[PDB]
Amino acid sequence: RLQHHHHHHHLEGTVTTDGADIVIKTKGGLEVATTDKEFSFKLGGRLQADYSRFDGFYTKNGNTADAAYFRRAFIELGGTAYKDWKYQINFDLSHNTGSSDNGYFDEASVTYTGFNPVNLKFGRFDPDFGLEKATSSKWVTAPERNAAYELADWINTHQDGMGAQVNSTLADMAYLSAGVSAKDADDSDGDSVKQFNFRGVFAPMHEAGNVLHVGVNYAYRDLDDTAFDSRIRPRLGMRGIATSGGNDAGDNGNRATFGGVSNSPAGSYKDDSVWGLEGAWAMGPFSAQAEYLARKLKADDNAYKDIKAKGYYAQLAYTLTGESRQYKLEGAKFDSVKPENKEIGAWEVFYRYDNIKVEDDNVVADTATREVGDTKAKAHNLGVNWYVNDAVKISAAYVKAKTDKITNNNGDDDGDGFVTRLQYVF
Amino acid sequence: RLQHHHHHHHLEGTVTTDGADIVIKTKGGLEVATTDKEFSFKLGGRLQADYSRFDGFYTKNGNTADAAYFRRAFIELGGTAYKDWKYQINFDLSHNTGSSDNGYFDEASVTYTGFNPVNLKFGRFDPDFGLEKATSSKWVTAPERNAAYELADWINTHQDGMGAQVNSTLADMAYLSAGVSAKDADDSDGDSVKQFNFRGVFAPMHEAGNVLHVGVNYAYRDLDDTAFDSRIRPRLGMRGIATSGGNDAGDNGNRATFGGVSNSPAGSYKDDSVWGLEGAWAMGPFSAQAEYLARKLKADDNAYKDIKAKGYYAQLAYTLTGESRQYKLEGAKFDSVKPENKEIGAWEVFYRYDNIKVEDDNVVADTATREVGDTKAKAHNLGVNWYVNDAVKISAAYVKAKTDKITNNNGDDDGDGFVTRLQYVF
Amino acid sequence: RLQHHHHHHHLEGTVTTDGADIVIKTKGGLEVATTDKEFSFKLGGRLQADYSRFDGFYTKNGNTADAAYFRRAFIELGGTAYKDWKYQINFDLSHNTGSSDNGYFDEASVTYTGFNPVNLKFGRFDPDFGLEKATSSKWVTAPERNAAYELADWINTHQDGMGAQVNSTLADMAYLSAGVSAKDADDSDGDSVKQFNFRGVFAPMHEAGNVLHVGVNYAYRDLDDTAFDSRIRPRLGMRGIATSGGNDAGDNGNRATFGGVSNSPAGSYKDDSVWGLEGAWAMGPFSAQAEYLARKLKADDNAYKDIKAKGYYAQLAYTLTGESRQYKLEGAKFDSVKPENKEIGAWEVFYRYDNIKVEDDNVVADTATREVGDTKAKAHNLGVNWYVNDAVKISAAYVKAKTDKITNNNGDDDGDGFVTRLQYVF
């Protein structure tokens, strides 16, 4: 018996909703929201495709290595329900963020905004320490963030745990955020490392092309009875020396240990503190920003000595085509450049100088590549960003690093690299 | 030569379709569907953020451990095409469901619904055994499902294989489901473990606030010539003793082996059977439900003896604010509570009692923590669910466990824990 | 103090946009696009659910093994911004494509189309070599692609690297593509393997049911100072002998090494070249296509000898219900069958013959299963595709393989298998 049915006529062409009026938008992804602000959804993401070549100190033998990888490949889902409840889930397909055991999350958070301007944020999200870190990874001026953060990257990374943060703008001239987090490392009882963060910024001028910003950061974590990796291992602006998400320098990459050890035993260190300062000034297309931080990792057991590190960076940026870097008091952070000329886009030049010093008195004998005393590095990052349009940014940068009391296997105390990136935001 | 073009005028503001009329909705995610029911799409998900602390038997040394993790972080894509063909793909970003080798699937299925009320379901999906299991993981009353399922978790998990299931409501008073599945373990010829499931429920009253439900479950698998993990390792309501998706109790978590072994050799066991009973009654905001199951893992080689286990739970729940738990005859399962009061939400209290017994006559000598004979555990789970709104549920629960013939390293025969969860459904 | 608010009235029912007019569509997924072609977004995917059984040479002992797995489970996000900038991100939830270190990408690309008909494509995407490979994995006629590609699968796989490709149709009768890529393997300096691809097709007739197609392919890679896996390990049409995404034949799967070694040392080989030919002819529901390729892997160090391999396939296909296979000059590739009869769908029968030969003079002694000389295999793939509708395709195929100078442990020189697939495209 063959199948059959009466012919149906279908009404065609309209798009409607059964609830509150909806506005839908696309700039390459999708946004849908009710006009009464009760409900919304946004699907987006970011692709950062990098190719780099580098030599000298950046590699073990000093010869040129390369890397061809996605720095980030986020899929981003966020939304609002019942006006005051937001979520944001950003997962990194490149596997550079998060982990196999715990999920490749850049963020998985829920925010209650009912106390606006005060927000309450929960879940897995990087703690707020530092201006360059607060700035979206889409819009950080240099291809990689500064080396001073590499002295204590726990201060502003989620480390596969959970946290709770309160934040607010204040008096139309300031921003404060404070939070507690549990990080993914246990003491001998299976109790996680607990961490406190504070950030406070005074930014009396806080708009694109008109920024005056000074801030303070503090981070503390309790390492009592906890085995942990104390290594400071800066990449000094060259991600490709060691990275997920594609090809890297492999066995010839030199992500060097400037201090600390991979397995510091339970009981070796008691706690770990970092203070930071931020400054920024912007007038139209010109901006200057800088940060300084200092870490003290405090020994517990007498066989161990404190480890200290200090670092800073300063950056100048200028949009040759005249546009301002966006700036938001909510988060006290820079953001994108929006090109005014549709035919040629926006062109931005930048220079960042980084300087770090590691004081690890536990290093008591020379190795083949590392001398007793304070290890140091300086880096220079000079480059161009072409904002083709709001979605696409193409970048090229030259990076140079110079070190003290540490070399590669070739004896190099400096190295050079070039990195190019194609970024697509949707 | 500079680029240029004539100015174009674009029509603005309208949203239309070229096919059948579409209705679009958002409650934080996205639904799009043609009004003639031919085509639909839904993007959603669920975040379950847990923080817990626990001690005694829950940890190896008895001291307090913690856990801070996502129990589930699903992204959910489902849709319909040509009316009768549905798909559902739920992937767990927390990596608590599925595996690295095979995909982190909660579900990846295709359902043909053309024989409605009869459905034919194919792909990777948990077999249907048990009421608490059939209930969505969004809406299970207690933070973790009962310990009786932990006696034989193969009965209602997909185990990275594939299956085919037929199901239907019957006579407006019953629900039946039966299926076959291939599970991810091979015999010496590389042929997968095959499993049969049946579930039948009589529910003459089957609506929110008016439920009378009795059901039977059966599961069978053939383990001929197959090496397998026969361990029964209950978490007794405390997920954080050992979990993916974030921080757990690490080396101090005590997910204890009550019976069975990690590598039971090919030829040791022939087959494995489980029978189960379900009962539920609901009148308005009050509900009572309970399940009992019994397992016989039947030895093949004479060196091995049968392993038996029996378990049950009973749960009372009451919505203090008066709302009913939703109930669906399709799937014969409870579902959500929908809050009536928008300002305070819905408040639900629950108590679940669990009781398990493992009879493994292959354990023929004491270990340091486990005595010859039948191992037993009882657990009590007492808690509160706050349904803030349809999307957000916040929970807190106290859990206590007491064991017989098994302790931790500290000699504890009981333990306590507290778990809190923030759930966001979109 | 209880919460309260004035009652708000909300406008209901409309769906609008603030920019250019939008058209939205769903066939199970989602498409949204502005009518002026400036912006678009598409969320889709593909599920390929496979069950297979196989014996003889396909397994080590010759007995029947099975497999129950997803061949592919892609989530697909693609879009357009500012008219000329496209992206496509396809991630494989089954974990059969890409890797844990680098991301499970089938594709993560950005394409600039402003030079239309010339495209510039960047990112992680399979290089273009071969007609059956260019054809979407949704619409390849046989359940697995041919064995000749298995002789040199680097020629048309991204291998977790990055690349740049230029392509264009020409003169309304041809298609050309050429590209460079960095592949995920380093020389001793950490510099990636670089690869060149060219493909050129003359297709004076290039529409569904009217195809005349001849093409040439070339691929080259530089292996100087690079350790690499030179093994040729064909599955001969039976994916389930060894696969991710679910259960496979495990320890009894025989994915046999026909030549090459797992760790060919740095300096062993200098470069690697493959030439290929393509031919296709289609008249209405009948099509014939074939490809031939030859590889020379050229030794560097004198201890090593060149490895050569040659392979081809030929396929006949006929749509019993009369429909043509779609064909696109852009990409010079076949595509789907679109069923005309809504009640019974489209039915297609196919036969593919594969023939491969591996000449590895480095194999200088017999092993227990492999004789000195040229190893060979032939395979026959006979099957049916039922295109239920545009979204759903169900397939069944018989596969037989016969080998020369290589057997399994049972001494089998042939084997048989059957594979069934349910595919859902959205």
UniProtKB/Swiss-Prot annotation, chains A, B, C:
Main location, first listed in the record: membrane
InterPro entries in alphabetical order: Porin_dom_sf, Porin_O/P
GO cellular component terms given for this protein: cell outer membrane; pore complex
Gene Ontology BP terms: monoatomic ion transport
Membrane topology category: Multi-pass membrane protein
Example GO molecular function: porin activity
Protein name in the entry: Porin O
Organism: Pseudomonas aeruginosa (strain ATCC 15692 / DSM 22644 / CIP 104116 / JCM 14847 / LMG 12228 / 1C / PRS 101 / PAO1)
Organism placement in taxonomy: Bacteria, Pseudomonadati, Pseudomonadota, Gammaproteobacteria, Pseudomonadales
